[PDB]
Amino acid sequence: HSREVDCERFIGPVPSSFTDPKVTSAQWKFLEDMADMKALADLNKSLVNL
Amino acid sequence: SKTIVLSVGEATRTLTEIQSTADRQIFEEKVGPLVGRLRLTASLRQNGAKTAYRVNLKLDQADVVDCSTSVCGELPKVRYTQVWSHDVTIVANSTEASRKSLYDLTKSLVATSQVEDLVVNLVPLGR
Amino acid sequence: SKTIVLSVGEATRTLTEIQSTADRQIFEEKVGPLVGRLRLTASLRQNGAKTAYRVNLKLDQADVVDCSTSVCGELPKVRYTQVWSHDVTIVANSTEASRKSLYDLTKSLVATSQVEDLVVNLVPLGR
Amino acid sequence: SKTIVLSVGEATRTLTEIQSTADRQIFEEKVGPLVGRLRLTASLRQNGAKTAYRVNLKLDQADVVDCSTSVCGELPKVRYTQVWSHDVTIVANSTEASRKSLYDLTKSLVATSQVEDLVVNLVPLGR
Amino acid sequence: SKTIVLSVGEATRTLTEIQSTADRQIFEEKVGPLVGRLRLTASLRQNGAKTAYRVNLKLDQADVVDCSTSVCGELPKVRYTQVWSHDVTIVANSTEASRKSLYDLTKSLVATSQVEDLVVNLVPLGR
Amino acid sequence: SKTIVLSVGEATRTLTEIQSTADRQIFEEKVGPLVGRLRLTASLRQNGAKTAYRVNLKLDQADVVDCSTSVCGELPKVRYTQVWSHDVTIVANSTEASRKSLYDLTKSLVATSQVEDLVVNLVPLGR
Amino acid sequence: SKTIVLSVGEATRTLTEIQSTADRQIFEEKVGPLVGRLRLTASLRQNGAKTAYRVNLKLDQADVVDCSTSVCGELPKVRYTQVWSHDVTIVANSTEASRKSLYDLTKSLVATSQVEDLVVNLVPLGR
Numbered sequence: 169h170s171r172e173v174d175c176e177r178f179i180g181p182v183p184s185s186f187t188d189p190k191v192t193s194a195q196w197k198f199l200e201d202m203a204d205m206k207a208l209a210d211l212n213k214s215l216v217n218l
Numbered sequence: 219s220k221t222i223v224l225s226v227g228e229a230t231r232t233l234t235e236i237q238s239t240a241d242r243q244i245f246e247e248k249v250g251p252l253v254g255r256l257r258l259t260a261s262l263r264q265n266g267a268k269t270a271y272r273v274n275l276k277l278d279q280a281d282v283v284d285c286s287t288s289v290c291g292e293l294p295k296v297r298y299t300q301v302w303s304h305d306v307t308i309v310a311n312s313t314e315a316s317r318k319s320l321y322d323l324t325k326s327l328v329a330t331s332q333v334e335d336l337v338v339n340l341v342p343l344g345r
Numbered sequence: 346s347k348t349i350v351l352s353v354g355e356a357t358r359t360l361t362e363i364q365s366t367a368d369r370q371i372f373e374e375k376v377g378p379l380v381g382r383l384r385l386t387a388s389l390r391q392n393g394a395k396t397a398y399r400v401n402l403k404l405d406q407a408d409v410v411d412c413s414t415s416v417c418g419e420l421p422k423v424r425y426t427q428v429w430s431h432d433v434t435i436v437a438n439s440t441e442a443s444r445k446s447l448y449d450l451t452k453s454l455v456a457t458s459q460v461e462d463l464v465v466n467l468v469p470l471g472r
Numbered sequence: 473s474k475t476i477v478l479s480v481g482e483a484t485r486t487l488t489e490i491q492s493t494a495d496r497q498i499f500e501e502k503v504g505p506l507v508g509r510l511r512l513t514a515s516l517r518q519n520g521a522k523t524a525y526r527v528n529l530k531l532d533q534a535d536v537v538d539c540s541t542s543v544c545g546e547l548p549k550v551r552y553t554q555v556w557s558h559d560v561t562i563v564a565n566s567t568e569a570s571r572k573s574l575y576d577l578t579k580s581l582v583a584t585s586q587v588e589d590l591v592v593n594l595v596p597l598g599r
Numbered sequence: 600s601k602t603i604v605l606s607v608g609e610a611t612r613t614l615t616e617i618q619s620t621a622d623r624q625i626f627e628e629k630v631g632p633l634v635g636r637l638r639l640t641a642s643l644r645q646n647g648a649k650t651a652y653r654v655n656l657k658l659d660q661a662d663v664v665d666c667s668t669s670v671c672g673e674l675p676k677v678r679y680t681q682v683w684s685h686d687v688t689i690v691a692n693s694t695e696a697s698r699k700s701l702y703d704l705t706k707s708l709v710a711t712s713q714v715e716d717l718v719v720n721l722v723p724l725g726r
Numbered sequence: 727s728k729t730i731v732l733s734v735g736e737a738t739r740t741l742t743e744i745q746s747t748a749d750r751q752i753f754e755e756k757v758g759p760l761v762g763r764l765r766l767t768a769s770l771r772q773n774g775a776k777t778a779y780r781v782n783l784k785l786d787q788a789d790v791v792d793c794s795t796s797v798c799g800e801l802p803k804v805r806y807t808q809v810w811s812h813d814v815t816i817v818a819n820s821t822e823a824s825r826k827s828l829y830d831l832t833k834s835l836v837a838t839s840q841v842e843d844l845v846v847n848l849v850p851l852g853r
Numbered sequence: 854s855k856t857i858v859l860s861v862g863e864a865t866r867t868l869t870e871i872q873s874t875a876d877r878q879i880f881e882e883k884v885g886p887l888v889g890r891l892r893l894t895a896s897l898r899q900n901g902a903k904t905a906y907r908v909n910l911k912l913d914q915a916d917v918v919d920c921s922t923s924v925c926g927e928l929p930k931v932r933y934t935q936v937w938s939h940d941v942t943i944v945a946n947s948t949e950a951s952r953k954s955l956y957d958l959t960k961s962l963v964a965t966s967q968v969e970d971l972v973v974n975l976v977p978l979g980r
């Protein structure tokens with residue numbers, strides 16, 4: 169005998185962790201503060217080429 | 219020799235004394251590759267006319283890279299080098315309580331979250 | 346020829362005489378690839394006006410690498426080379442007891458744990 | 473200081489550090505007469521462009537003679553001098569297992585009976 | 600033409616006469632790529648003043664390599680070359696029994712395990 | 727010393743090592759008269775710049791005659807001399823499987839009936 | 854190695870092989886001081902066009918003196934040197950009975966009392 173396999177079928181289902189993530193308000197505030205600080209820090213470097 | 223145990227949170231690192239000398243103490247971390255690892259240089263001396271003292275503490279750690287896992291020939295090569303030196307100028311005739319308070323203040327400033335942010339995000343200290 | 350059996354602990358290595366000559370004896374280890382293996386050079390001579398003698402013993406071993414297991418074309422290539430030479434200057438009219446004591450002291454210094462640490466951890470000898 | 477204990481079989485000899493220096497470590501045996509005794513010179517350095525290293529180990533021992541037991545005047549005078557130097561050229565980026573195997577092979581070659589016969593009876597190594 | 604069948608143990612190789620000439624017979628193995636394969640050169644002549652004869656037999660085989668399986672462009676390239684020549688100097692007025700005994704001795708020396716070890720492990724013949 | 731046993735079919739011949747040297751190994755057969763017997767010369771060397779090697783194997787056997795059985799007076803005198811040299815040029819970094827296949831092919835070509843006919847009947851190889 | 858036992862009448866002396874080589878065999882007696890002792894040089898070769906052979910046997914023994922028993926400083930110093938060489942020119946195709954008779958005659962001439970008197974009293978041989 170000689171069997172031919174199609175690897176596009178012999179794989180289990182998709183896990184249940186492929187859902188939308190949950191982000192808290194504290195995490196959002198922390199990330200926004202960090203982003204604002206980094207943005208204000210990047211500005212001070214551009215004026216060096218005055 | 220002399221062993222120093224450092225707790226990082228989940229693992230314990232061991233530093234071993236290598237170059238035992240009075241004017242220069244060299245501690246080296248023993249984990250795997252000795253080249254490009256964690257090294258510590260300590261020095262103690264005097265100053266002027268036997269007034270105060272001078273203590274120097276430097277900590278270096280150079281990262282290494284290797285391609286023998288995929289590429290078929292590359293020796294472990296160092297990448298960048300980091301230097302973190304210190305300078306302690308404390309007079310002998312001082313105060314034990316003042317020295318303890320200064321050490322506690324330094325420990326608090328090191329353990330605070332502002333210096334960590336200054337190191338990571340490169341944001342100037344000012345919270 | 347001339348065979349030398351060396352016990353490493355769990356296996357036995359065999360070195361075979363290759364270049365039989367008075368002023369230069371070359372022993373080579375026979376295990377697999379002859380190129381980049383264990384070689385030993387021995388030499389014996391005199392000095393000055395038939396006073397003392399001179400014995401030289403060198404041991405070399407170069408590591409090899411190969412990529413034919415994964416890469417589809419790479420000949421066995423040597424990497425680094427290690428040289429460990431010696432120098433024996435013992436006069437003829439000496440003392441058998443003194444020579445035996447010196448050999449025992451050398452054997453003890455070789456078998457001690459300080460030289461092993463100096464070789465491995467590259468820590469200067471001083472325990 | 474730094475003490476080294478060597479076991480000869482029935483007695484224990486003690487070597488003491490005398491000249492503590494990085495580029496030259498001088499150990500001297502303390503038994504009786506300091507002049508004409510057992511001395512050991514150790515040196516460690518680098519090479520080329522921070523590639524490998526170089527270790528040198530020399531062991532000297534000069535015999536002494538005295539006639540004050542019978543003759544009514546003769547200071548302790550040295551007789552012959554023996555020099556046994558070494559040379560270690562091991563690269564940093566090597567292999568711990570290979571270094572351990574090389575050290576074990578060297579220890580076996582030192583502890584074998586062929587080198588002892590070559591030293592004592594001055595017979596060329598070849599059994 | 601002229602076909603020669605050689606049994607290796609599990610497969611049979613076929614060599615075909617290519618260059619039919621008296622003073623030089625060239626046999627070439629036909630398997631796949633003709634370049635870098637098995638070739639055999641045979642020659643027969645006389646010597647001096649019609650005393651004895653001279654027979655020469657050489658066998659060459661150069662390995663080939665190719666990268667068209669993975670790399671997208673590399674012609675079959677030869678690597679090393681091996682030369683195994685012979686020399687037969689047998690006089691005409693000899694002895695058939697002596698020639699048969701010599702051929703049997705040569706066959707036994709070829710089929711013995713000592714020459715195989717000398718070829719593989721490169722260990723000098725001496726068991 | 728070193729003994730080699732060769733089986734001719736009904737009797738066993740013994741060759742003994744006589745001139746033990748690295749660059750020239752001389753084996754002689756011990757049966758009766760030592761002069762005009764079976765001798766074997768083996769040599770092993772390198773080539774160029776440590777690339778490959780060179781092995782030489784020669785086998786000589788000179789027949790002897792004597793008239794002391796009938797004639798009053800005649801010392802054993804040699805008649806003809808046969809020379810069968812070899813030449814092995816195998817590189818170190820090769821292939822064990824390729825070397826084994828080449829040795830098997832050489833053994834088959836030696837044991838075949840074509841070379842025997844070429845030796846005996848002096849007929850050129852071509853069946 | 855190779856040991857040779859010689860019986861002098863009341864004690865047995867032991868000579869040990871030192872320098873094992875084909876063209877030069879050096880045997881040295883092991884009793885005490887190796888310098889200035891009993892040595893024996895043996896050599897075997899051929900001659901002309903593979904006609905006869907040449908054997909050389911030399912026996913040397915230099916006496917030593919020492920003053921450390923009374924004088925307070927004198928190393929063992931050699932005095933005179935004696936050389937007794939030989940020369941054997943025996944052809945291969947000879948006679949076993951003739952060789953045995955010649956050896957017996959030489960042994961008788963050595964064991965006779967005339968050569969002993971010639972050696973001791975320096976009186977010319979003629980009794």
